[PDB]
Design a binder for this molecule. Sequence first.
Ligand SMILES: O[C@@H]1[C@@H](O)[C@H](O[C@@H]2CO[C@@H](O[C@@H]3CO[C@@H](O)[C@H](O)[C@H]3O)[C@H](O)[C@H]2O)OC[C@H]1O
Length: 189
Amino acid sequence: TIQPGTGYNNGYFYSYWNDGHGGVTYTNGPGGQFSVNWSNSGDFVGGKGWQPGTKNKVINFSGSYNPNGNSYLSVYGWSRNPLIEYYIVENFGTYNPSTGATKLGEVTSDGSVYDIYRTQRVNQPSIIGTATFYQYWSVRRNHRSSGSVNTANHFNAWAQQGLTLGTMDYQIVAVEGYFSSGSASITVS
Ligand SMILES: O[C@@H]1[C@@H](O)[C@H](O[C@@H]2CO[C@@H](O[C@@H]3CO[C@@H](O)[C@H](O)[C@H]3O)[C@H](O)[C@H]2O)OC[C@H]1O
């Protein structure tokens, strides 16, 4: 278990962030493994991967993901210039994060169709400070907690649609929660 922060563990970058409300623990395990256990949490994100990510990584993940309430399991990361927060959502809990969002197309990858969306965060926290920035989403129709994500298929479809990415910052497989409960154990490579 670690303080919220970033660093490296067993060859993998990790990021663990929370809002200080309590109710969530994040643990780094061997190799690319991490666990999250939460019960009436606040807002949080944690997981393992790479710093920087790339635009053609094939990301493999496997494990168990058991949210009770609002949570996502995604390939998650940022670009700079432009500042973008992006998600390739493989599974979620009570809330589909694209609800009410503008649909920007579809892409087929790794055994499922994904729906593509763009949203905007206004004066919200980010990797560079408070900012207004777009988020890009691919939301998998057929939910799962193991698989392979060919990120190029998503990034290329986004680019085709005008959702351009700048220089990649970190890129992880993340469990995100917003005032929920759950458990998860995920191994990345
Ligand atoms: O110390 C600073 C860190 O706190 C900072 O981390 C990023 C802050 O932005 C976080 O993203 C939110 C996650 O939840 C989504 O729903 C929101 O739109 C995001 O804003 C991100 O996960 C952290 O990496 O990094 C910069 C450091 O200076």
